[PDB]
Amino acid sequence: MELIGDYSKAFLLQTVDGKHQDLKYISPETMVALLTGKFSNIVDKFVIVDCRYPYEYEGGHIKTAVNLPLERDAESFLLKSPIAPCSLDKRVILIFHDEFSSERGPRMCRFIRERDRAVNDYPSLYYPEMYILKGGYKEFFPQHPNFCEPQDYRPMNHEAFKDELKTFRLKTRSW
């Protein structure tokens, strides 16, 4: 397997097959391994980026996940003041996810890499190691409900949030 984005070392996590062949996908079990500190001696910090709309996130998200559905907010939160490790011997990892392990997560993942490359001298990167959560929140919740809060799941197409979906869409950069 290829090295991470800045060609400094191998990917740390075991991966599974996903829709986007060139992106790295991880299972819910691996996500839990990270959350339970199985890689604490190597990974100083990781950020779970929930790319779903606010109402979806509010209806149930992975503990500690940050909701960054808009490109400009994801870029500000991640690249304005890059999240770095307390030791340049430890790793920083990003994990993006959406609802059905479809397009919103992969899209943001590619966007961040594009911006990361743009503000660095090749091949250096602030976030060389990024993954997509296979199955999204839809598959994570039924596997590890106690790693979610609240313990529920609100689909993007929930019948009671049709207007909320439209309201959010009108804040995006492109459609």
Residues of this chain that interact with Cl ion (CB under 5 A) are 18-19, 70-71, 101, 172-173
Least distance to Cl ion from the beta carbon of 60, Å?
20
Q: 5 vs 18, which CB is nearer to Cl ion?
A: 18
Q: 27 vs 46, which CB is nearer to Cl ion?
A: 27
Cα 96 to its chain centre, rounded Å, is: 2
Least distance to Cl ion from the beta carbon of 42, Å?
26
Residues 136/27, Cβ–Cβ less than 8 Å? no
Residues 34/93, Cβ–Cβ less than 8 Å? yes
**Amino acid, single-letter form, for residue 116:** D
**Which residue sits closest to Cl ion, CB atoms considered?**
19
**Amino acid, single-letter form, for residue 164:** E
Least distance to Cl ion from the beta carbon of 30, Å?
14
Q: Which residues contact 90 (CB under 8 A, 6 or more apart)?
A: 42, 43, 44
Q: 39 vs 111, which CB is nearer to Cl ion?
A: 111
Residues 14/30, Cβ–Cβ less than 8 Å? yes
Least distance to Cl ion from the beta carbon of 8, Å?
27
Q: What are phi and psi of 86, to 5 degrees?
A: -75, -5
Q: 73 vs 152, which CB is nearer to Cl ion?
A: 73
